[PDB]
Amino acid sequence: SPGIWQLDCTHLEGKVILVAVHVASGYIEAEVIPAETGQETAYFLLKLAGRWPVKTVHTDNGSNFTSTTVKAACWWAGIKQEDGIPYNPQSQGVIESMNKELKKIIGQVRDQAEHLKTAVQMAVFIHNHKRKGYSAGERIVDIIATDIQ
Amino acid sequence: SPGIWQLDCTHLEGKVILVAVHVASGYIEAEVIPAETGQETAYFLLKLAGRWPVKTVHTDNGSNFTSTTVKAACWWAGIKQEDGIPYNPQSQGVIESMNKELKKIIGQVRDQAEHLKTAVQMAVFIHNHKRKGYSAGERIVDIIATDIQ
Numbered sequence: 001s002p003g004i005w006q007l008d009c010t011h012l013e014g015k016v017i018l019v020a021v022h023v024a025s026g027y028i029e030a031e032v033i034p035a036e037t038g039q040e041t042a043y044f045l046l047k048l049a050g051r052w053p054v055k056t057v058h059t060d061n062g063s064n065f066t067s068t069t070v071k072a073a074c075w076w077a078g079i080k081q082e083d084g085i086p087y088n089p090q091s092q093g094v095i096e097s098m099n100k101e102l103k104k105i106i107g108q109v110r111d112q113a114e115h116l117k118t119a120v121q122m123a124v125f126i127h128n129h130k131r132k133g134y135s136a137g138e139r140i141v142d143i144i145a146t147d148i149q
Numbered sequence: 150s151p152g153i154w155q156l157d158c159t160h161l162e163g164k165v166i167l168v169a170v171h172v173a174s175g176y177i178e179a180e181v182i183p184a185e186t187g188q189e190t191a192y193f194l195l196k197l198a199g200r201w202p203v204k205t206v207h208t209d210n211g212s213n214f215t216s217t218t219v220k221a222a223c224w225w226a227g228i229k230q231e232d233g234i235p236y237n238p239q240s241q242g243v244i245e246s247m248n249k250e251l252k253k254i255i256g257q258v259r260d261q262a263e264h265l266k267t268a269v270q271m272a273v274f275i276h277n278h279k280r281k282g283y284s285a286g287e288r289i290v291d292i293i294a295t296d297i298q
């Protein structure tokens with residue numbers, strides 16, 4: 001459980017926002033890229049796995065799942081690469097709802113920055129700090145620290 | 150002390166590596182930028198503070214300490230911006246030692262990537278996972294989680 005993350009890709013202003021969600025807490029990291037390519041996904045995962053203990057990643061689509069660059073990064077980083085098929089058929093709805101909420105947050109800060117990438121990082125900040133009550137950031141630290149503490 | 154971070158800026162291959170260290174654990178995040186400007190430092194801090202609970206940052210120099218773009222990001226993110234003067238005079242050697250170690254790691258992976266930014270993120274991964282027997286990544290989550298609970 002504490003090592004599991006889900007990748008998610010969404011589009012806004014003709015750019016791509018790649019998101020990784022820590023499935024047990026709802027904590028996220030996100031970046032703006034020009035387009036989702038295996039190389040960008042690989043580098044996003046290498047960043048993520050240097051910062052948090054990423055044991056398993058459910059990939060967002062079959063292109064990333066197949067990408068040899070992605071598989072090379074997963075190998076390098078000790079990550080088990082898995083599919084992101086909604087085996088629980090409520091996973092597709094959860095992912096859609098997350099993107100809608102993320103885009104709502106982005107719209108709430110959009111005017112405070114020139115560049116979309118800045119507004120996305122403001123939106124990561126607001127989501128991870130939001131109380132609902134613990135925040136996502138509190139939950140992920142409690143989850144991982146319990147895992148041997 | 151669980152919210153305290155130190156910024157640090159080092160140079161390699163004619164590029165700038167900006168580093169934030171979590172003082173109590175030694176955990177780091179790092180990025181490659183063309184040059185240290187207020188805008189890049191501000192954006193780096195906004196990313197950091199969306200991901201970890203950053204209460205105080207000791208800035209790496211007086212230009213960032215003065216930068217109104219940095220001060221605006223610190224206000225936005227709820228960060229107390231402080232100087233990074235080694236009032237504890239060993240603090241100078243500790244920072245240069247960290248840079249030399251980081252550049253050693255980078256040299257150990259440099260050949261496995263075309264682009265410096267990828268080698269820096271590999272180095273972040275290796276440092277944060279290194280056992281010294283707990284890792285930096287383990288220490289920071291234990292520090293912050295003990296603070297929550």
Ligand SMILES: O=C(O)c1c(CN2C(=O)Cc3cc(Cl)ccc32)ccc2c1OCCO2
Pocket residue numbers: 006021022023024025026027028094095097098099101102127
């Ligand atoms: O409120 C949401 O819908 C939301 C969520 C909801 N969420 C959880 O709490 C757990 C979880 C697992 C997965 Cl697989 C996807 C989303 C979520 C996560 C991230 C977000 C969200 O909203 C916007 C920004 O990021």
Ligand SMILES: O=C(O)c1c(CN2C(=O)Cc3cc(Cl)ccc32)ccc2c1OCCO2
Pocket residue numbers: 112113114115116117118119187188189191192195218219221222223225226
């Ligand atoms: O206008 C922008 O998008 C931008 C900004 C804009 N801006 C400021 O000038 C002060 C500030 C605080 C915060 Cl919390 C967010 C954005 C900004 C800062 C750094 C950047 C930016 O672009 C991307 C890289 O660095």
Ligand SMILES: O=C(O)c1c(CN2C(=O)Cc3cc(Cl)ccc32)ccc2c1OCCO2
Pocket residue numbers: 128129130135136137138141151152198199200201202204293294296297298
């Ligand atoms: O402030 C939060 O909601 C938060 C927290 C909350 N919190 C803790 O549980 C421990 C802690 C220490 C400090 Cl000194 C400030 C806030 C927190 C932890 C990690 C985060 C957070 O938000 C950013 C993502 O990581």
Ligand SMILES: O=C(O)c1c(CN2C(=O)Cc3cc(Cl)ccc32)ccc2c1OCCO2
Pocket residue numbers: 155170171172173174175176177243244246247248250251254276
């Ligand atoms: O071994 C080191 O010197 C080292 C350190 C040492 N370190 C700690 O453990 C605590 C600490 C506080 C501060 Cl203010 C600076 C460095 C460190 C941190 C990060 C690194 C390091 O080397 C590799 C890259 O990151």
Ligand SMILES: O=C(O)c1c(CN2C(=O)Cc3cc(Cl)ccc32)ccc2c1OCCO2
Pocket residue numbers: 039040042043046068069070072073074076077261262263264265266267268
């Ligand atoms: O050659 C690079 O530096 C690079 C790479 C190189 N590379 C692979 O092709 C597979 C791989 C695994 C890992 Cl663990 C690190 C780098 C690479 C991937 C993504 C990138 C890169 O550069 C920019 C960001 O995206």
Ligand SMILES: O=C(O)c1c(CN2C(=O)Cc3cc(Cl)ccc32)ccc2c1OCCO2
Pocket residue numbers: 002003049050051052053054055144145147148277278279284285286287290
């Ligand atoms: O693997 C580590 O050394 C590590 C850890 C170590 N560890 C824990 O304390 C709990 C845990 C759960 C899992 Cl499932 C894997 C590793 C760890 C935590 C955070 C990190 C780590 O390294 C990456 C940065 O964040």
